From Swiss-Prot, chain A:
<comment type="function">
    <text>Component of the Mediator complex, a coactivator involved in the regulated transcription of nearly all RNA polymerase II-dependent genes. Mediator functions as a bridge to convey information from gene-specific regulatory proteins to the basal RNA polymerase II transcription machinery. Mediator is recruited to promoters by direct interactions with regulatory proteins and serves as a scaffold for the assembly of a functional preinitiation complex with RNA polymerase II and the general transcription factors.</text>
</comment>
<protein>
    <recommendedName>
        <fullName>Mediator of RNA polymerase II transcription subunit 16</fullName>
    </recommendedName>
</protein>
<feature type="repeat" description="WD 5">
    <location>
        <begin position="189"/>
        <end position="228"/>
    </location>
</feature>
<comment type="subunit">
    <text>Component of the Mediator complex, which is composed of MED1, MED4, MED6, MED7, MED8, MED9, MED10, MED11, MED12, MED13, MED13L, MED14, MED15, MED16, MED17, MED18, MED19, MED20, MED21, MED22, MED23, MED24, MED25, MED26, MED27, MED29, MED30, MED31, CCNC, CDK8 and CDC2L6/CDK11. The MED12, MED13, CCNC and CDK8 subunits form a distinct module termed the CDK8 module. Mediator containing the CDK8 module is less active than Mediator lacking this module in supporting transcriptional activation.</text>
</comment>
<feature type="repeat" description="WD 4">
    <location>
        <begin position="69"/>
        <end position="110"/>
    </location>
</feature>
From Swiss-Prot, chain B:
<comment type="subunit">
    <text>Component of the Mediator complex, which is composed of MED1, MED4, MED6, MED7, MED8, MED9, MED10, MED11, MED12, MED13, MED13L, MED14, MED15, MED16, MED17, MED18, MED19, MED20, MED21, MED22, MED23, MED24, MED25, MED26, MED27, MED29, MED30, MED31, CCNC, CDK8 and CDC2L6/CDK11. The MED12, MED13, CCNC and CDK8 subunits form a distinct module termed the CDK8 module. Mediator containing the CDK8 module is less active than Mediator lacking this module in supporting transcriptional activation.</text>
</comment>
<comment type="similarity">
    <text>Belongs to the Mediator complex subunit 15 family.</text>
</comment>
<comment type="function">
    <text>Component of the Mediator complex, a coactivator involved in the regulated transcription of nearly all RNA polymerase II-dependent genes. Mediator functions as a bridge to convey information from gene-specific regulatory proteins to the basal RNA polymerase II transcription machinery. Mediator is recruited to promoters by direct interactions with regulatory proteins and serves as a scaffold for the assembly of a functional preinitiation complex with RNA polymerase II and the general transcription factors. Required for cholesterol-dependent gene regulation.</text>
</comment>
<protein>
    <recommendedName>
        <fullName>Mediator of RNA polymerase II transcription subunit 15</fullName>
    </recommendedName>
</protein>
Swiss-Prot record, chain C:
<keyword id="KW-0539">Nucleus</keyword>
<comment type="subunit">
    <text>Component of the Mediator complex, which is composed of MED1, MED4, MED6, MED7, MED8, MED9, MED10, MED11, MED12, MED13, MED13L, MED14, MED15, MED16, MED17, MED18, MED19, MED20, MED21, MED22, MED23, MED24, MED25, MED26, MED27, MED29, MED30, MED31, CCNC, CDK8 and CDC2L6/CDK11. The MED12, MED13, CCNC and CDK8 subunits form a distinct module termed the CDK8 module. Mediator containing the CDK8 module is less active than Mediator lacking this module in supporting transcriptional activation.</text>
</comment>
<protein>
    <recommendedName>
        <fullName>Mediator of RNA polymerase II transcription subunit 29</fullName>
    </recommendedName>
</protein>
<dbReference type="GO" id="GO:0070847">
    <property type="term" value="C:core mediator complex"/>
</dbReference>
<dbReference type="GO" id="GO:0060261">
    <property type="term" value="P:positive regulation of transcription initiation by RNA polymerase II"/>
</dbReference>
From Swiss-Prot, chain D:
<protein>
    <recommendedName>
        <fullName>Mediator of RNA polymerase II transcription subunit 14</fullName>
    </recommendedName>
</protein>
<comment type="similarity">
    <text>Belongs to the Mediator complex subunit 14 family.</text>
</comment>
<comment type="subunit">
    <text>Component of the Mediator complex, which is composed of MED1, MED4, MED6, MED7, MED8, MED9, MED10, MED11, MED12, MED13, MED13L, MED14, MED15, MED16, MED17, MED18, MED19, MED20, MED21, MED22, MED23, MED24, MED25, MED26, MED27, MED29, MED30, MED31, CCNC, CDK8 and CDC2L6/CDK11. The MED12, MED13, CCNC and CDK8 subunits form a distinct module termed the CDK8 module. Mediator containing the CDK8 module is less active than Mediator lacking this module in supporting transcriptional activation.</text>
</comment>
<comment type="function">
    <text>Component of the Mediator complex, a coactivator involved in the regulated transcription of nearly all RNA polymerase II-dependent genes. Mediator functions as a bridge to convey information from gene-specific regulatory proteins to the basal RNA polymerase II transcription machinery. Mediator is recruited to promoters by direct interactions with regulatory proteins and serves as a scaffold for the assembly of a functional preinitiation complex with RNA polymerase II and the general transcription factors.</text>
</comment>
Length: 240, 167, 123, 48
């Protein structure tokens, strides 16, 4: 909904939705195919770089490196990548952040090295599996070889926001009345918390003030319950 | 020479100590690969229950455990439980001649004082002339004791005065 | 033909200056990252890779360490040779020296076997 | 002092091997030192 576009013949929502029906590869061509002007909304756009850009980049890169992990200790391995619609949303995100980088130089780097940007081949292989994952289609072997090898731009250690388990149906429960024994989305996951770190349902545990300037959309969005995040806890800042 | 990192750490005022994560940990985990530098489980309860709750401050306990077996300390009427913590009712049961048990009520373990108080002395000492001389000698010795202590110093001085002033 | 002392002497200033340069570029990357994240974008300039810096630093460190270790090994070899053999080489007859070395090895092996049989008899 | 390798064990039995003359980016440059390209070490180890 960040489309604060000038009045046009149609709305930005339906236009970004129909952007899915686009060319095969080279998103640098898709951007000129649809539009490139009416996307800027603020000069102080430096909000998703330190928080979201690295996040979405790590997510898509893990989605890449997951392909050679077909023989994983799981029938679906780590994930499916059989929807395409979500991948279409990811493509909309990557093209709009390409426009952002064209406008605001605080774009999303490759996070390791050798940007020679580098998201081009990434988007290319995403679309290559897209034609294999749009609708009523099976997964391809050339894309396997294309994704198997890795460049000097492939980090690791992704968050994987999830909740700790509680499988005490009739089996086992290692707890008492007190003394929990120890064993994030907008980043802010250091080694030991040094802020409010408002605990939440599953993974958030985000800081209460967040030291924000204009990213108030997220904070004002997560004041109430969250997805598997109604369990807003007050876990103390027992840093160790 | 590289004070630049020092002034940068000085600059690091904002609470978001997570940018340095993305700044440093990629290359660190790349060139150094100990993802588990301590896979040993660490889950211990710091404070469950730890208290004596059944005796006096054990400082005086460890002190009185060292004294000679010729000193027999007992328990007086309950007026030195926790704060005063000491009712030095002692008997010099040994080969030497016996005498009147001392009082020697010291103070909290901080020790801004000593034991000798001598409450029951008023009639225990003036009645017997020899015991009166013993009391005189013990007072003269205690006054010459710079900052006497809880059990050792007081009882030692008392015994030596009792067995020196025989004459 | 470079010498271990010479290679050490020429590597130490390169190591120091590489340390200085990598620390400077690390500070530059840190202040740029903070300005882009904490404050507003002011450092409108591309930084460096920052990985090659400490990578080549560790490379030169490993090189220095292994060459100094080789020099130490050479000195230890010379010391043990002078202790276990007299300084004589083309003066001493080479076949006689080879036979003496073989006899020394056989004698050491015999002493080791004797101590091993002793330990076994202790068992 | 030539053709460095680097093996290291981290998991219960997992010991990874790499060529120490690449600097995490082979297409860019080299380590200005020990000679790279030890050869087909990958298949040599994959033998077992």
């Amino acid at each position: 909904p960040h489309f604060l576009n000038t009045p046009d013949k149609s709305p930005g929502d339906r236009l970004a939705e129909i952007c899915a029906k686009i060319t095969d590869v080279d998103i640098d061509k898709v951007m000129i195919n649809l539009k490139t002007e009416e996307f800027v909304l603020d000069m102080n756009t430096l909000q998703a770089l330190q928080q979201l850009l690295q996040w979405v980049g790590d997510f898509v890169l893990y989605l890449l490196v997951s392909l050679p992990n077909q023989g994983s200790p799981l029938r679906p391995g780590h994930s499916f990548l059989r929807d395409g619609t979500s991948l279409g949303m990811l493509r909309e995100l990557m093209v709009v952040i390409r426009i952002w980088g064209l406008l605001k130089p605080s774009c999303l780097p490759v996070y390791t090295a050798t940007s020679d940007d580098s998201m081009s081949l990434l988007f290319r292989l995403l679309t290559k599996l897209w034609i294999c994952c749009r609708d009523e289609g099976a997964a391809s072997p050339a894309s396997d070889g294309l994704v198997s090898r890795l460049q000097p731009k492939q980090p690791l250690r992704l968050r994987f926001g999830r909740a700790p388990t509680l499988p005490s149906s009739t089996s086992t429960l290692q707890l008492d009345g007190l003394t929990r024994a120890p064993g994030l989305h907008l980043g802010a996951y250091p080694t030991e918390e040094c802020k409010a770190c408002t605990r939440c349902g599953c993974v958030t545990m985000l800081k209460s003030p967040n030291k924000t300037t204009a990213v108030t959309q997220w904070e004002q969005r997560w004041i109430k319950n969250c997805l598997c995040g109604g369990l807003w806890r007050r876990v103390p800042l027992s840093c160790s | 020479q590289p004070l630049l990192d020092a002034v940068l750490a000085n600059i690091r005022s904002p609470v978001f100590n997570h940018s340095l994560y993305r700044t440093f940990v990629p290359a660190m985990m790349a060139i150094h690969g100990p993802p588990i530098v301590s896979p040993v489980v660490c889950s211990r309860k710091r404070r469950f229950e730890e208290d004596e709750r059944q005796s006096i401050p054990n400082v005086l306990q460890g002190e009185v455990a060292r004294l000679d077996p010729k000193f027999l300390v007992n328990l007086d009427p309950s007026h030195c439980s926790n704060n005063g913590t000491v009712h030095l009712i002692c008997k010099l049961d040994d080969k030497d001649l016996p005498s009147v048990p001392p009082l020697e009520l010291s103070v909290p373990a901080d020790y801004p004082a000593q034991s000798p108080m001598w409450i029951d002395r008023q009639w225990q000492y003036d009645a017997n002339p020899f015991l009166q001389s013993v009391h005189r000698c013990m007072t003269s010795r205690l006054l010459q004791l710079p900052d006497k202590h809880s059990v050792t110093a007081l009882l030692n001085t008392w015994a030596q005065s009792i067995h020196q002033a025989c004459l | 033909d470079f010498d271990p002392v010479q290679r050490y002497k020429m590597l130490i200033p390169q190591l120091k200056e590489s340390l200085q340069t990598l620390m400077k570029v690390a500070a530059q990357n840190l202040i740029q990252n903070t300005n882009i994240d904490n404050g507003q974008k002011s450092s409108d300039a591309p930084l460096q890779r920052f990985d090659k810096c400490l990578e080549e630093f560790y490379a030169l460190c490993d090189q220095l360490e292994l060459c100094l270790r080789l020099a130490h090994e050479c000195l230890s070899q010379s010391c043990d040779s002078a202790k276990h053999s007299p300084t004589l080489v083309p003066s001493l007859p080479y076949p006689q020296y080879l036979a003496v070395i073989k006899a020394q090895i056989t004698c050491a092996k015999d002493i080791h076997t004797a101590l091993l049989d002793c330990a076994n008899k202790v068992t | 002092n030539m053709y460095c390798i680097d093996i290291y064990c981290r998991s219960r039995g997992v010991v990874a091997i790499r060529d120490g003359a690449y600097s995490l980016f082979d297409n860019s440059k080299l380590v200005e030192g020990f000679y790279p390209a030890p050869g087909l070490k990958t298949f040599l180890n994959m033998f077992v």
